Design an enzyme around this catalytic site. Structure first.
Site, PDB file in Angstrom:
ATOM      1  N   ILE B  14      39.682 -16.884  28.255  1.00  0.00           N
ATOM      2  CA  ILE B  14      38.629 -15.910  28.038  1.00  0.00           C
ATOM      3  C   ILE B  14      38.623 -15.405  26.604  1.00  0.00           C
ATOM      4  O   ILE B  14      37.692 -14.717  26.208  1.00  0.00           O
ATOM      5  CB  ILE B  14      38.678 -14.738  29.027  1.00  0.00           C
ATOM      6  CG1 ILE B  14      40.002 -13.995  29.001  1.00  0.00           C
ATOM      7  CG2 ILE B  14      38.311 -15.238  30.416  1.00  0.00           C
ATOM      8  CD1 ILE B  14      40.077 -12.843  29.978  1.00  0.00           C
ATOM      9  N   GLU B  16      41.033 -15.374  22.491  1.00  0.00           N
ATOM     10  CA  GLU B  16      42.087 -15.814  21.604  1.00  0.00           C
ATOM     11  C   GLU B  16      42.356 -14.677  20.626  1.00  0.00           C
ATOM     12  O   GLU B  16      41.713 -13.629  20.697  1.00  0.00           O
ATOM     13  CB  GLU B  16      41.592 -17.115  20.985  1.00  0.00           C
ATOM     14  CG  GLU B  16      42.634 -17.744  20.073  1.00  0.00           C
ATOM     15  CD  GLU B  16      42.124 -19.058  19.516  1.00  0.00           C
ATOM     16  OE1 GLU B  16      40.969 -19.424  19.818  1.00  0.00           O
ATOM     17  OE2 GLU B  16      42.886 -19.732  18.789  1.00  0.00           O
ATOM     18  N   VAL B  22      44.216 -15.362  25.656  1.00  0.00           N
ATOM     19  CA  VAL B  22      44.043 -14.598  26.882  1.00  0.00           C
ATOM     20  C   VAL B  22      43.411 -15.487  27.959  1.00  0.00           C
ATOM     21  O   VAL B  22      42.441 -16.205  27.723  1.00  0.00           O
ATOM     22  CB  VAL B  22      43.177 -13.359  26.612  1.00  0.00           C
ATOM     23  CG1 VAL B  22      43.039 -12.518  27.866  1.00  0.00           C
ATOM     24  CG2 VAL B  22      43.695 -12.528  25.443  1.00  0.00           C
ATOM     25  N   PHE B  86      41.355  -6.879  34.637  1.00  0.00           N
ATOM     26  CA  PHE B  86      40.350  -7.813  34.154  1.00  0.00           C
ATOM     27  C   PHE B  86      38.963  -7.171  34.137  1.00  0.00           C
ATOM     28  O   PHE B  86      38.572  -6.552  35.117  1.00  0.00           O
ATOM     29  CB  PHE B  86      40.289  -9.050  35.052  1.00  0.00           C
ATOM     30  CG  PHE B  86      39.131  -9.972  34.723  1.00  0.00           C
ATOM     31  CD1 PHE B  86      39.171 -10.780  33.593  1.00  0.00           C
ATOM     32  CD2 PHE B  86      37.986  -9.992  35.513  1.00  0.00           C
ATOM     33  CE1 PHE B  86      38.092 -11.609  33.278  1.00  0.00           C
ATOM     34  CE2 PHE B  86      36.919 -10.842  35.209  1.00  0.00           C
ATOM     35  CZ  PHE B  86      36.976 -11.660  34.101  1.00  0.00           C
ATOM     36  N   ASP B 131      40.405   0.757  15.782  1.00  0.00           N
ATOM     37  CA  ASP B 131      39.629  -0.474  15.723  1.00  0.00           C
ATOM     38  C   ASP B 131      38.547  -0.435  16.797  1.00  0.00           C
ATOM     39  O   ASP B 131      38.308  -1.430  17.494  1.00  0.00           O
ATOM     40  CB  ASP B 131      40.518  -1.701  15.828  1.00  0.00           C
ATOM     41  CG  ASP B 131      39.929  -3.030  15.386  1.00  0.00           C
ATOM     42  OD1 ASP B 131      39.150  -3.070  14.410  1.00  0.00           O
ATOM     43  OD2 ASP B 131      40.326  -4.037  15.988  1.00  0.00           O
ATOM     44  N   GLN B 135      33.254  -5.358  20.375  1.00  0.00           N
ATOM     45  CA  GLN B 135      34.086  -6.474  20.801  1.00  0.00           C
ATOM     46  C   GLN B 135      35.319  -5.936  21.530  1.00  0.00           C
ATOM     47  O   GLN B 135      35.955  -6.658  22.297  1.00  0.00           O
ATOM     48  CB  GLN B 135      34.548  -7.317  19.606  1.00  0.00           C
ATOM     49  CG  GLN B 135      33.450  -7.963  18.760  1.00  0.00           C
ATOM     50  CD  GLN B 135      32.637  -7.065  17.821  1.00  0.00           C
ATOM     51  OE1 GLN B 135      32.831  -5.848  17.659  1.00  0.00           O
ATOM     52  NE2 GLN B 135      31.661  -7.684  17.167  1.00  0.00           N
ATOM     53  N   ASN B 136      35.689  -4.676  21.258  1.00  0.00           N
ATOM     54  CA  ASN B 136      36.929  -4.103  21.775  1.00  0.00           C
ATOM     55  C   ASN B 136      36.619  -3.113  22.895  1.00  0.00           C
ATOM     56  O   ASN B 136      37.481  -2.330  23.285  1.00  0.00           O
ATOM     57  CB  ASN B 136      37.757  -3.437  20.679  1.00  0.00           C
ATOM     58  CG  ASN B 136      38.488  -4.424  19.803  1.00  0.00           C
ATOM     59  OD1 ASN B 136      38.613  -5.605  20.135  1.00  0.00           O
ATOM     60  ND2 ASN B 136      38.957  -3.975  18.653  1.00  0.00           N
ATOM     61  N   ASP B 149      42.120  -3.427  23.382  1.00  0.00           N
ATOM     62  CA  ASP B 149      42.810  -3.934  22.208  1.00  0.00           C
ATOM     63  C   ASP B 149      43.458  -2.795  21.406  1.00  0.00           C
ATOM     64  O   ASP B 149      42.855  -2.251  20.478  1.00  0.00           O
ATOM     65  CB  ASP B 149      41.937  -4.884  21.396  1.00  0.00           C
ATOM     66  CG  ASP B 149      42.707  -5.682  20.345  1.00  0.00           C
ATOM     67  OD1 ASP B 149      43.936  -5.445  20.177  1.00  0.00           O
ATOM     68  OD2 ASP B 149      42.084  -6.557  19.709  1.00  0.00           O
TER      69      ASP B 149
HETATM   70  C1  LIG Z   1      36.521 -10.404  27.273  1.00  0.00           C
HETATM   71  C2  LIG Z   1      36.844 -10.774  28.704  1.00  0.00           C
HETATM   72  O1  LIG Z   1      36.369 -11.740  29.191  1.00  0.00           O
HETATM   73  N1  LIG Z   1      37.798 -10.082  29.368  1.00  0.00           N
HETATM   74  C3  LIG Z   1      38.925  -9.427  28.840  1.00  0.00           C
HETATM   75  C4  LIG Z   1      39.684  -8.516  29.581  1.00  0.00           C
HETATM   76  C5  LIG Z   1      40.792  -7.906  29.001  1.00  0.00           C
HETATM   77  C6  LIG Z   1      41.156  -8.246  27.697  1.00  0.00           C
HETATM   78 BR1  LIG Z   1      42.666  -7.419  26.866  1.00  0.00          BR
HETATM   79  C7  LIG Z   1      40.426  -9.183  26.971  1.00  0.00           C
HETATM   80  C8  LIG Z   1      39.318  -9.793  27.552  1.00  0.00           C
END
Ligand SMILES: CC(=O)Nc1ccc(Br)cc1
Ligand SMILES: CC(=O)Nc1ccc(Br)cc1
Ligand SMILES: CC(=O)Nc1ccc(Br)cc1
EC number: 2.7.11.22
Lengths: 261, 302
Positions: B14, B16, B22, B86, B131, B135-136, B149
């Protein structure tokens, strides 16, 4: 005031007060340590004080490290030959967490005079992470001191530096400072600094913040006062040497009061 | 540390990052869907990375519905797996792919309000995120949005001391950082959220600079070049220069035209120059802009 987070300082204080209890070492751990003593720890902490100075690390880093060490020795039995390896790994973890620019692992290996290998330091670093379960954001004496300082009217650098110094001296001796919470030693330290320099006492306003009074601080303050009195004679001297520096206003050169009155 | 990798089934990649990949995985015993972040230690000649040490330590302490939950940490051979709650998507992907004609005001309001809840919880537990960017910020299928993050995160003291300069992805970076401030505080996270607020409205970045100075000027061109009146200290700041062009402050209704009076009020307080006057996440929760949010609070997670 945002540097002093007006909207969060109380919340933060309350939260540090609860986590100091969670992050507290076992008061009488050294009795259950078969091969190490309060004296060996004092030598260890004193050295970390020097490592701290050698690599211009934050005082916060020193404080975290000692917290990590005492919490580790609270559940792990350690031979004297390995005590310094625990100290080294602790200082490395405290550096990674607290320092903008932590020393490289190889600098930690270097200051142990190649007693240990990079592999040993790294494996120990993990062992400690395991034993502490990564529970590294520990309240330190310093974290409380800096908030107490906000109550000075007016601010006084000699008071600040002197309180920091007394705080540090407490790290050296598990007997009797393991029995006191950071927040309490910090209070003792602040009042003693204040009183030495200005003749003033623990302010009402910190009674409001903390719930502590001179009554409740008295045991700790009596010990801290003895420690301060005897600091020239203590076997460990690195903290006094450090606090001759102008960076700390040369406060180790001030005279302690003969009585607290 | 109740878990082992035997109990997880990888589903798909999902994401990197700097220290690894990840995956979306499934707990084969409970059914729980998780995100596994693998941190490699074999490759590291510097033992456990400082980023990971802060992420793990600070996240242990932060149990909040609007902060992504760390469920577990598995320390295997030369490998560290962080097991996370998740969430199917991030806010940037949401804005890009589905908010074509816009994000509805209800949802913007709901999201901003949750973000402030989680950030206030961060500041209340002496953590700077440092940050915040779309995206975060992770979104689930139920309408929850959660700060994620914490690799750039930092436990602060009161008062703060000098921390890492040039933190925060540039587009979201507060002026005081761009000006090489000695000290920064909770206000930098607010600045980020304000950039994000605007971006949820327009679906484009508020200040997309391509250098620190272009970033500074894009801000100055939008909120006016600050002076001693709006920001005491500004002209003394280490990277402040007298030669900075002096731009008039444009009417704030022109910065995000579709935004209502309540919206503009809140936004202006998030983007105040002087970090001392900038609104806190705590104060911001009581802003009128949120009067009509009714989306029920997300549950904690365990
Ligand atoms: C972006 C996504 O699909 N899911 C997700 C969930 C937790 C983290 Br930490 C990073 C990604
Ligand atoms: C003092 C003593 O007997 N031995 C010893 C060994 C290592 C350290 Br670190 C401190 C002391
Ligand atoms: C720093 C840089 O790259 N460019 C720049 C441009 C104008 C001023 Br005034 C200061 C700097």
């Amino acid at each position: 005031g945002v540097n002093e987070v007006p909207d969060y300082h109380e919340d933060i204080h309350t939260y540090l007060r609860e986590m100091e209890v969670k992050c507290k070492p076992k008061v009488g751990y050294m009795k259950k340590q078969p091969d190490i003593t309060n004296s060996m720890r004092a030598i260890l902490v004193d050295w970390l004080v020097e490592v701290g100075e050698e690599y211009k690390l934050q005082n916060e880093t020193l404080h975290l490290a000692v917290n990590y060490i005492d919490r580790f020795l609270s559940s792990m039995s350690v031979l004297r030959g390995k005590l310094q390896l625990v100290g080294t790994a602790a200082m490395l973890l405290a550096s990674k967490f607290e320092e903008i620019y932590p020393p490289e692992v190889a600098e930690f290996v270097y200051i142990t005079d190649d007693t240990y290998t990079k592999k040993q330091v790294l494996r120990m670093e993990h062992l400690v992470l395991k034993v502490l379960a990564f529970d590294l954001a520990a309240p330190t004496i310093n974290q409380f001191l800096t908030q107490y300082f906000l109550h000075q009217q007016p601010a006084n650098c000699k008071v600040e530096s002197l309180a920091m110094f007394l705080g540090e001296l407490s790290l050296i001796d598990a007997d009797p400072y393991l029995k006191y919470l950071p927040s309490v030693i910090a209070a003792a330290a602040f009042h003693l600094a204040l009183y030495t320099v200005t003749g003033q006492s623990w302010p009402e306003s910190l009674v409001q913040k903390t719930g502590y009074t001179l009554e409740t601080l008295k045991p700790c303050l009596l010990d801290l006062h003895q420690t301060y009195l005897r600091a020239p004679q203590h076997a460990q001297q690195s903290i006094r040497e450090k606090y001759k520096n102008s960076k700390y206003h040369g406060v180790s050169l001030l005279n302690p009061p003969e009585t607290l009155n | 540390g109740p878990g082992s990798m035997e109990n997880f089934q990888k589903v798909e990649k999902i994401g990197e990052g700097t220290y690894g990949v990840v995956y979306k995985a499934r707990n084969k015993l409970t059914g729980e869907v998780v995100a596994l972040k693998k941190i490699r230690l074999d490759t590291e000649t510097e033992g456990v990375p400082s980023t990971a040490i802060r992420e793990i330590s600070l996240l242990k302490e932060l149990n909040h519905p609007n902060i992504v939950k760390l469920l577990d940490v598995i320390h295997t051979e030369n490998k560290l797996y962080l097991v996370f709650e998740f969430l199917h998507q991030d806010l940037k992907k949401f804005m890009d792919a589905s908010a074509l004609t816009g994000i509805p005001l209800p949802l913007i309001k709901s999201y901003l309000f949750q973000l402030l809840q989680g950030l206030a919880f961060c500041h209340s537990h002496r953590v700077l995120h440092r940050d915040l960017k779309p995206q975060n910020l992770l979104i689930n299928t139920e309408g929850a949005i959660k700060l994620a993050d914490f690799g750039l995160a930092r436990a602060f003291g009161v008062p703060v001391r000098t921390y890492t300069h040039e933190v925060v992805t540039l587009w979201y970076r507060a002026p005081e950082i761009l000006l090489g401030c000695k000290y920064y505080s909770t206000a930098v996270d607010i600045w980020s959220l304000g950039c994000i607020f605007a971006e949820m409205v327009t679906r484009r970045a508020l200040f997309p600079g391509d250098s620190e100075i272009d970033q500074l000027f894009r801000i100055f061109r939008t909120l006016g070049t600050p002076d001693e009146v709006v920001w005491p200290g500004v002209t003394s700041m280490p990277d402040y220069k007298p030669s900075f062009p002096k731009w008039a402050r444009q009417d704030f209704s022109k910065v995000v035209p579709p935004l209502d009076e309540d919206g503009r009020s809140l936004l202006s307080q998030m983007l105040h120059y002087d970090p001392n006057k900038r609104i806190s996440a705590k104060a911001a929760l009581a802003h009128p802009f949120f009067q009509d949010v009714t989306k029920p609070v997300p549950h904690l997670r365990l």
